[PDB]
Design an enzyme around this catalytic site. Structure first.
Site, mmCIF file in Angstrom:
data_model
loop_
_atom_site.group_PDB
_atom_site.id
_atom_site.type_symbol
_atom_site.label_atom_id
_atom_site.label_comp_id
_atom_site.label_asym_id
_atom_site.label_seq_id
_atom_site.Cartn_x
_atom_site.Cartn_y
_atom_site.Cartn_z
ATOM 1 C CE1 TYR B 91 50.443 79.615 85.109
ATOM 2 C CE2 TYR B 91 49.998 77.410 85.956
ATOM 3 C CZ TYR B 91 49.553 78.578 85.371
ATOM 4 O OH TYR B 91 48.236 78.689 84.993
ATOM 5 C CG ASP B 150 43.395 68.543 82.948
ATOM 6 O OD1 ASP B 150 42.451 67.752 83.021
ATOM 7 O OD2 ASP B 150 43.332 69.621 82.363
ATOM 8 C CG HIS B 387 51.615 74.718 78.332
ATOM 9 N ND1 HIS B 387 50.542 75.016 79.141
ATOM 10 C CD2 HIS B 387 52.177 73.616 78.868
ATOM 11 C CE1 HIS B 387 50.487 74.151 80.142
ATOM 12 N NE2 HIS B 387 51.470 73.288 80.005
ATOM 13 C CE1 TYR B 468 45.011 79.695 87.771
ATOM 14 C CE2 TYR B 468 45.135 78.952 90.036
ATOM 15 C CZ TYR B 468 45.252 78.686 88.685
ATOM 16 O OH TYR B 468 45.607 77.425 88.275
ATOM 17 N NE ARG B 469 49.693 77.193 89.521
ATOM 18 C CZ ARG B 469 49.334 75.926 89.359
ATOM 19 N NH1 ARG B 469 48.098 75.630 89.004
ATOM 20 N NH2 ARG B 469 50.209 74.956 89.551
HETATM 21 C C1 LIG Z 1 49.445 70.699 79.730
HETATM 22 C C2 LIG Z 1 49.345 71.245 81.131
HETATM 23 C C3 LIG Z 1 48.191 71.081 81.857
HETATM 24 C C4 LIG Z 1 48.074 71.569 83.169
HETATM 25 N N1 LIG Z 1 46.892 71.363 83.823
HETATM 26 C C5 LIG Z 1 46.785 71.825 85.038
HETATM 27 C C6 LIG Z 1 45.573 71.638 85.727
HETATM 28 O O1 LIG Z 1 44.621 71.058 85.231
HETATM 29 N N2 LIG Z 1 45.483 72.121 87.006
HETATM 30 C C7 LIG Z 1 46.513 72.769 87.601
HETATM 31 O O2 LIG Z 1 46.334 73.163 88.749
HETATM 32 N N3 LIG Z 1 47.688 72.975 86.971
HETATM 33 C C8 LIG Z 1 47.825 72.527 85.744
HETATM 34 N N4 LIG Z 1 49.020 72.704 85.069
HETATM 35 C C9 LIG Z 1 50.120 73.430 85.734
HETATM 36 C C10 LIG Z 1 51.132 72.528 86.466
HETATM 37 O O3 LIG Z 1 51.821 71.714 85.524
HETATM 38 C C11 LIG Z 1 50.533 71.630 87.560
HETATM 39 O O4 LIG Z 1 49.719 72.397 88.432
HETATM 40 C C12 LIG Z 1 51.571 70.873 88.398
HETATM 41 O O5 LIG Z 1 50.933 69.813 89.112
HETATM 42 C C13 LIG Z 1 52.291 71.748 89.400
HETATM 43 O O6 LIG Z 1 53.571 71.156 89.756
HETATM 44 P P1 LIG Z 1 53.733 70.335 91.122
HETATM 45 O O7 LIG Z 1 52.436 69.701 91.478
HETATM 46 O O8 LIG Z 1 54.943 69.479 90.993
HETATM 47 O O9 LIG Z 1 54.065 71.495 92.171
HETATM 48 P P2 LIG Z 1 55.475 72.106 92.618
HETATM 49 O O10 LIG Z 1 56.203 72.507 91.388
HETATM 50 O O11 LIG Z 1 56.157 71.163 93.543
HETATM 51 O O12 LIG Z 1 55.022 73.404 93.443
HETATM 52 C C14 LIG Z 1 54.613 74.620 92.776
HETATM 53 C C15 LIG Z 1 55.176 75.815 93.508
HETATM 54 O O13 LIG Z 1 54.581 75.911 94.827
HETATM 55 C C16 LIG Z 1 55.561 76.248 95.787
HETATM 56 N N5 LIG Z 1 55.752 75.095 96.650
HETATM 57 C C17 LIG Z 1 55.585 73.786 96.309
HETATM 58 N N6 LIG Z 1 55.807 72.970 97.310
HETATM 59 C C18 LIG Z 1 56.134 73.800 98.371
HETATM 60 C C19 LIG Z 1 56.470 73.537 99.711
HETATM 61 N N7 LIG Z 1 56.537 72.313 100.222
HETATM 62 N N8 LIG Z 1 56.732 74.599 100.507
HETATM 63 C C20 LIG Z 1 56.659 75.826 99.976
HETATM 64 N N9 LIG Z 1 56.349 76.191 98.735
HETATM 65 C C21 LIG Z 1 56.095 75.117 97.975
HETATM 66 C C22 LIG Z 1 56.801 76.674 95.010
HETATM 67 O O14 LIG Z 1 56.759 78.052 94.717
HETATM 68 C C23 LIG Z 1 56.687 75.804 93.759
HETATM 69 O O15 LIG Z 1 57.393 76.362 92.660
HETATM 70 C C24 LIG Z 1 49.162 72.245 83.757
HETATM 71 C C25 LIG Z 1 50.335 72.410 82.999
HETATM 72 C C26 LIG Z 1 50.442 71.913 81.710
HETATM 73 C C27 LIG Z 1 51.693 72.135 80.897
#
Ligand SMILES: Cc1cc2nc3c(=O)[nH]c(=O)nc-3n(C[C@H](O)[C@H](O)[C@H](O)COP(=O)(O)OP(=O)(O)OC[C@H]3O[C@@H](n4cnc5c(N)ncnc54)[C@H](O)[C@@H]3O)c2cc1C
Ligand SMILES: Cc1cc2nc3c(=O)[nH]c(=O)nc-3n(C[C@H](O)[C@H](O)[C@H](O)COP(=O)(O)OP(=O)(O)OC[C@H]3O[C@@H](n4cnc5c(N)ncnc54)[C@H](O)[C@@H]3O)c2cc1C
Lengths: 519, 519
Positions: B91, B150, B387, B468-469
């Site tokens: 994303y 995951d 991806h 949804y995203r």
């Molecule tokens: C192989 C693969 C599998 C995946 N599987 C899953 C899965 O099972 N489930 C799933 O949900 N996702 C999945 N993802 C997507 C993603 O990689 C994960 O959700 C990941 O955990 C999101 O990054 P993060 O937790 O560091 O969030 P962040 O990158 O820190 O936050 C995401 C976004 O939320 C906002 N944000 C974050 N923190 C704040 C804050 N404090 N204040 C305001 N806005 C904020 C920003 O817009 C930010 O860009 C997958 C991706 C891959 C490549």
């Protein structure tokens, strides 16, 4: 004494507004003085007749009429008090915070747009009652239950928006909301969630949609007028077993709450089960005068007599099991084993209740979502009165439960009223709703009730306890208790209020939010 | 090339802002020039090097530092892209929608403020990973499970805010949120819910507090910077049994979805269980080259070989039972009997898996909240790639499920990619996440992927389906799909945006929200 005009609104501006309202809804559906009686708070608290007085009421039948009403209110600076059904008894009824406000009564907007058995949801307009949704479901033979906030006379929508509570697993009414239509304070209409997607089939299926999740900003709010709402409904379960566990001693609530915590956090207690005090439960089937000739709160001998007469305790834990028999048996073993060693504990299923007119048989209906008016019975306790709700939140811990019990019961009884307490078990919290029954026709009782309520709020706040909901008279006081960082949150609320409602024409004073024109 | 300056911001304004950022956080924690590469999208889509480029990053250690960064951003008009851990791979990673935005990286704010066993919650700062919270719980021997999306290396906070999903009963991450601290775009700090009550002991116990319910407006949003968040955690259950039910035919997803609906709406399926396509599951333990020599998507004969080799179906239903053995047995009977009559169905518990390294043995860990990094394994399918997630929402209906499958699978395969589909079962909906694996190093593959994504979005919207995203590159496109009533909802979002962030310095472009200065 007639209602005063709202401050800053001329008789000419009001009169032009009301003629325009009559053109929108029809002359039959604008109610002025000498039809305003039903919009007054039924349970008066103020001895000042200038306070909480609605100027008039307008009863639209469509979202379009709501939009035109809102546009006219902006044109003339005439504030509105939106209600779904207006049955917010013990929180002000349909009456506004600020005298001169015009009630926007959506009772006639009473379409059930859809009830979906396969996905377990309803989409309803605000005027839909619990009775009406329940009857639609029975007539159509749908295998769904609703969740009723004790009384069935109120609004599926209005009650949820005030963060209302019921007693099945779907007891957190606002949490079960999915999709809404809102008339913003500029008269524009929006749909949240998947409702924003033209030709969607998911409005009632997925809460969020995309982007900011805004549904909750229209609850306990004056940011918009909700005109349609979705709610999830529980599928009829494979089995249902209500239970009542009673406790002999007022101090048992400490150990009882400690035992409830792990059962509730693990989901062993499946519903919004309740712990109710003796007087709240006794008052459903008896009056004080049947046990006592005194003028004030009951003494211990009267409590013991009522307990032996009615098979009630000082604390009454009422809950229900749901699902297939092997699941209900497993959960029951865990619940029963948690309480069985407390001295004086008694267990009842409905078949164990000796009385034909009995609190458990009533609550057995409530906890399967049967709408009823039985809860008004407690208003007869002292010969006929109104009530007000003092509703602090507590952790599910004995120390907090017994502390709040002691602080509230002591003050209520000191002011001449019997303590009637409900501990509604939420996911991780207890809603401690104390219903104070008083002669709303007696200015001396009203004065005592007002002084008591202010003390209750102040002492609770001094102990770090806040209310989840309150009466129109105390909405500013409660807002001022959420003062962290010099009232930072209410500063944000006022920022949003000024952006969505620059003219402040939606429910000034709701939740202590006023807008720049009246702040 | 280097990142361009944000439009309307001068080199002098940027330079002044970055020096002030270094005064706040310390010179070691402002990243410019060569130090910015970790903030780039790891999975490039654009062939335009001027797009989605962060200018710099700032890494604060406290809410106070976040407040001073936001104040300085307002002073110089320098926009910020807040991230918790920045691991939003598929994303955009940590990269901003608008080139020249400075990433506000909260990785160093990684305190676990509290993990409460009695009430089952954690209170965490944004930089806390799923690994860190899991390891803390295991070190202290707390009887609590977490819920992992995951991957374990992202943020308990960040993932929840983006409406992320997991695979235990606590799989809807944002729904399990309770209380947050937010730095508003003016640099003022607020606490939601009971956090607004000085001296409270209920911030992580009761979601609403009093008045408008705003927590959700800071999710998928640029209305604020979340600096602390509570989340409910599941008590360790009395038993746990994971299962895999496989289906032989791509067309089985129709009847399989019809059977899942009543099981999920009644809560018989206790977790966010999943139905995953053959190639998505195969790709966790195998590569295409082990079954097939062509460089495009697999033919049917190859799918049949993979299925027999791996004991997988064209569709794989993976879920788990939770609780005492009598509960798990009762629910299993209902789930098993729902699918037993489908020709070609097969049922597996872990002991029935003949492969030592196996999809069910992986997901057995995920569905009890064990953090892992094995989900990246599917990136090896076609030699190695990035991806992107195409994530439409669907009702739990066979007709919608098979329609989305046919619409997406056909297009993805036409563009040279294998279909890898995840149907995550929510309360009343399916999140259809299609992971498109591509060579992010190849400009020609990136062109095809971008063309395919636009087609998928448009075709889904034409059928009333919304995502949804989404990835930073498509946030405007997706916002424009939610166009009901001439884009009424986004007009409201922009109204709130201009009220909270008049200077538009928080994540311009997040969820398609820009603010008056850039719309
Ligand atoms: C192989 C693969 C599998 C995946 N599987 C899953 C899965 O099972 N489930 C799933 O949900 N996702 C999945 N993802 C997507 C993603 O990689 C994960 O959700 C990941 O955990 C999101 O990054 P993060 O937790 O560091 O969030 P962040 O990158 O820190 O936050 C995401 C976004 O939320 C906002 N944000 C974050 N923190 C704040 C804050 N404090 N204040 C305001 N806005 C904020 C920003 O817009 C930010 O860009 C997958 C991706 C891959 C490549
Ligand atoms: C004896 C007794 C027992 C009670 N038991 C319970 C109980 O068990 N559970 C419980 O929850 N309550 C209980 N109550 C309180 C109350 O009577 C009910 O909650 C009642 O259902 C609320 O009235 P209503 O549903 O008509 O809502 P309304 O009065 O229509 O709405 C309540 C408020 O929400 C806002 N609102 C409503 N609709 C809209 C809208 N469309 N747009 C914007 N704002 C709106 C307004 O501020 C309005 O004043 C009890 C009261 C009494 C006296």
């Amino acid at each position: 004494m007639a209602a005063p005009l709202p401050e800053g609104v001329s008789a000419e501006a009001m009169s032009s507004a009301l003629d325009r309202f009559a053109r929108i809804v029809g002359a039959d559906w604008v109610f002025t003085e000498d039809k305003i009686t039903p919009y007054e708070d039924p349970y008066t608290i103020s001895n000042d007749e200038t306070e909480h007085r609605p100027y008039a009421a307008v009863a639209p039948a469509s979202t379009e009429e709501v939009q035109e009403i809102v546009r006219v209110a902006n044109e003339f600076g005439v504030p509105l008090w939106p209600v779904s059904r207006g049955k917010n008894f013990a929180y002000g009824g349909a009456a506004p915070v600020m005298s001169g406000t015009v009630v926007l009564d959506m009772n006639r907007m009473n379409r059930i747009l859809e009830v979906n058995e396969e996905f377990g949801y309803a989409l309803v307009e605000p005027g839909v009652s619990y009775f009406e949704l329940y009857d639609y479901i029975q007539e159509k033979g749908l295998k769904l239950w609703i969740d009723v906030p004790d009384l069935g006379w109120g609004s599926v929508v209005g009650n949820a928006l005030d963060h209302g509570i019921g007693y099945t697993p779907y007891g957190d009414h606002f949490a079960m909301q999915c999709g809404m239509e809102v008339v913003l304070p500029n008269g524009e209409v929006v749909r949240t969630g998947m409702g924003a997607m033209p030709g969607n089939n998911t409005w009632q299926l997925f809460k969020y949609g995309y982007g900011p999740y805004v549904d909750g900003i229209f609850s306990q709010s004056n940011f918009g007028v909700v005109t349609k709402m979705g709610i999830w409904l529980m599928p009829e379960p494979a089995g249902y077993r209500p239970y009542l566990i009673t406790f002999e001693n007022e101090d048992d609530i400490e150990t009882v709450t400690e035992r409830l915590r792990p059962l509730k956090v693990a989901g062993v207690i499946q519903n919004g089960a309740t712990v109710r005090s003796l007087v709240l439960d006794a008052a459903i089937t008896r009056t004080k005068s049947q046990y006592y000739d005194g003028d004030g709160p009951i003494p211990p001998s009267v409590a013991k007599t009522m307990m032996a007469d009615l098979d009630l305790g000082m604390w009454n834990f009422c809950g229900a099991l749901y699902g297939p028999p092997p699941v209900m048996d497993t959960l029951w073993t865990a619940i029963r084993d948690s309480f069985a060693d407390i001295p004086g504990v008694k267990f009842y299923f409905p078949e164990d209740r000796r009385h034909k007119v009995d609190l458990l048989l009533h609550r057995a209906e409530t906890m399967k979502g049967v709408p009823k008016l039985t809860e008004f019975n407690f208003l007869n306790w002292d010969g006929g009165g109104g009530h007000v709700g003092f509703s602090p939140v507590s952790p599910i811990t004995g120390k907090d439960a017994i502390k709040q019990y002691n602080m509230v019961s002591s003050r209520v009884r000191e002011y001449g009223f019997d303590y009637m307490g409900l501990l509604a078990i939420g996911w991780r919290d207890l809603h401690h709703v104390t219903v104070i029954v008083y002669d709303k026709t007696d200015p001396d009782e009203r004065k005592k009730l007002d002084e008591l309520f202010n003390i209750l709020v102040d002492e609770a706040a001094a102990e770090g306890y806040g209310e989840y909901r309150t009466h129109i008279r105390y909405m500013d006081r409660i807002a001022k208790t959420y003062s962290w960082n010099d009232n930072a949150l209410w500063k944000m609320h006022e920022t949003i209020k000024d952006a969505l409602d620059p003219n402040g024409i939606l429910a000034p004073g709701k939740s202590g939010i006023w807008g720049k024109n009246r702040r």
